[PDB]
Amino acid sequence: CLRANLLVLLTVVAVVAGVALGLGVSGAGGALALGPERLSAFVFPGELLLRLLRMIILPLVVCSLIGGAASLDPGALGRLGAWALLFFLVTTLLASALGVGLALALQPGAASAASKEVLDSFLDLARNIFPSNLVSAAFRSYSTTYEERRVKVPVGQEVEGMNILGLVVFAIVFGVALRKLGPEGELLIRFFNSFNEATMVLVSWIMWYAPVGIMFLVAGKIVEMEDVGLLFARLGKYILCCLLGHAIHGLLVLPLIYFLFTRKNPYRFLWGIVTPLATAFGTSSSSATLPLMMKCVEENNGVAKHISRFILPIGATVNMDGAALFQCVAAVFIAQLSQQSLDFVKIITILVTATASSVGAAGIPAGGVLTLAIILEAVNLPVDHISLILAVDWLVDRSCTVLNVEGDALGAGLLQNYVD
Numbered sequence: 001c002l003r004a005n006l007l008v009l010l011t012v013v014a015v016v017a018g019v020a021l022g023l024g025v026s027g028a029g030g031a032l033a034l035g036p037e038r039l040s041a042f043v044f045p046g047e048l049l050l051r052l053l054r055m056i057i058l059p060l061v062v063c064s065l066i067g068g069a070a071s072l073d074p075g076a077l078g079r080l081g082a083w084a085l086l087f088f089l090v091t092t093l094l095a096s097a098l099g100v101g102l103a104l105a106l107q108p109g110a111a112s113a114a115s116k117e118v119l120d121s122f123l124d125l126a127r128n129i130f131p132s133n134l135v136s137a138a139f140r141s142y143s144t145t146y147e148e149r150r151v152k153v154p155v156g157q158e159v160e161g162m163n164i165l166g167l168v169v170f171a172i173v174f175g176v177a178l179r180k181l182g183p184e185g186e187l188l189i190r191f192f193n194s195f196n197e198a199t200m201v202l203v204s205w206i207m208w209y210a211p212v213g214i215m216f217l218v219a220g221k222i223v224e225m226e227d228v229g230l231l232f233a234r235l236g237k238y239i240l241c242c243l244l245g246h247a248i249h250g251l252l253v254l255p256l257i258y259f260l261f262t263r264k265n266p267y268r269f270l271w272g273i274v275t276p277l278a279t280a281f282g283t284s285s286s287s288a289t290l291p292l293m294m295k296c297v298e299e300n301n302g303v304a305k306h307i308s309r310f311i312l313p314i315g316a317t318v319n320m321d322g323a324a325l326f327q328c329v330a331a332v333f334i335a336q337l338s339q340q341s342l343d344f345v346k347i348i349t350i351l352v353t354a355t356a357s358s359v360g361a362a363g364i365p366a367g368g369v370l371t372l373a374i375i376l377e378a379v380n381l382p383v384d385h386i387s388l389i390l391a392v393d394w395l396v397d398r399s400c401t402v403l404n405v406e407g408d409a410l411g412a413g414l415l416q417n418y419v420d
């Protein structure tokens with residue numbers, strides 16, 4: 001009955017009704033009929049849902065990772081983290097290879113009628129791994145700009161955007177330190193567990209408002225971006241390539257890996273995590289849907305508390321299969337647009353750069369375009385075409401987000417069988 005699956009049905013209905021309402025508003029005038037004053041009010045509920053989800057990201061992530069790191073032996077935690085990192089890297093590489101292969105086979109750039117250096121980007125990623133200030137890292141991330149002193153000198157500053165990766169690393173290290181302390185750190189372990197439980201209560205409350213926010217978010221997203229026909233006619237092949245790659249990875253490849261390692265049915269796991277998947281689609285942010293990911297993984301599935309609260313926060317930052325797939329597809333599409341020959345070395349470096357820079361993605365909406373330019377510059381491809389990718393990034397990115405969070409969930413389930 002619709003008693004325990006009421007949230008799943010409500011969220012699916014919310015997505016469908018948001019698409020329908022956005023299409024109806026667009027057909028009735030769209031932005032011109034509404035205007036900015038009415039558009040802001042129309043899309044406000046989705047922004048409210050995003051704010052509610054982002055408000056609890058820092059305490060939930062910090063407390064969950066501290067508890068998970070302090071709930072395991074340092075050797076066992078290290079082995080679990082190594083297996084998680086291997087799974088994340090393998091899945092990201094598979095997604096990148098699938099995206100490159102699909103783009104090469106289908107050739108979305110057949111119809112030709114339509115920053116930051118790589119080293120500095122990786123140095124910024126390393127700096128964000130080890131934050132210089134925890135309070136600053138709670139709302140700021142390091143980023144490198146350039147000064148034409150006309151040799152370009154890279155100078156860095158803390159820009160807006162939560163440094164989730166640095167908080168993750170610090171929380172893991174602090175949990176390990178608490179475990180090594182033992183009796184002295186037991187009080188802190190209890191404190192962080194209680195804080196995480198309270199944040200779980202807040203997540204359970206926000207989960208009921210989640211359908212309305214998702215509906216209004218998708219409605220506003222498809223209302224603001226008008227001329228859907230032109231978008232799907234000019235970049236239709238690229239959109240189809242990205243969506244097909246995401247669907248293949250999330251419904252064929254990742255479930256195949258889950259079934260091969262865990263003889264259980266992966267689609268039951270997917271049904272259990274449907275609600276955070278649709279939340280990821282609506283919000284286009286892995287971080288925002290991460291609390292719902294942990295909730296559904298812990299309750300709807302049989303994943304242990306420590307495994308989930310240690311793997312999902314890490315995967316929400318490191319494991320991004322959709323981002324890597326989209327970046328590889330976009331790189332091959334732009335190379336085909338410029339009639340650039342993609343040899344084996346170029347394909348290999350595209351795959352490597354996408355896999356390495358998917359970790360550096362912030363997990364925020366429209367976060368893949370900041371990485372696509374870096375990947376293009378790594379292969380010396382033209383960068384002026386990214387504007388085309390910006391035309392439909394409101395949709396593809398959303399799909400990417402789904403894949404991203406999905407992988408995380410499956411990894412947790414997989415690692416559950418590594419513990420049992």
Ligand SMILES: NC(=O)CC[C@H](N)C(=O)O
Pocket residue numbers: 284285286287320322323324326361362363364365366367368369396397400401402404405
């Ligand atoms: N295109 C992308 O995948 C960027 C990251 C995505 N917005 C996420 O949160 O997972």
Ligand code: NA
Pocket residue numbers: 087088089090091092093319320321407
């Ligand atoms: Na991966």
Ligand code: NA
Pocket residue numbers: 286315316317318319320321404405407408
């Ligand atoms: Na993720």
Ligand code: NA
Pocket residue numbers: 316317318319320357358359360361362363
């Ligand atoms: Na990332």
